[PDB]
């Protein structure tokens, strides 16, 4: 789950 606008997913995403 790579999200740039979403902060929630961002926490579990390195891409963003």
Distance CA 4, CA 11 (A): 10
Burial 1-16 (b: 16+ CB within 10 A, else e): eeeeeeeeeeeeeeee
Distance CA 2, CA 8 (A): 10
Distance CA 14, CA 3 (A): 9
Give the method of determination: NMR
Distance CA 14, CA 2 (A): 8
Residue-by-residue DSSP string for 1-16: ---SS-HHHHHT-S--
**Two structure tokens written together for 1:** 């789950």
């Amino acid at each position: 789950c790579c999200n740039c606008s979403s902060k929630w997913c961002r926490d579990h995403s390195r891409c963003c």
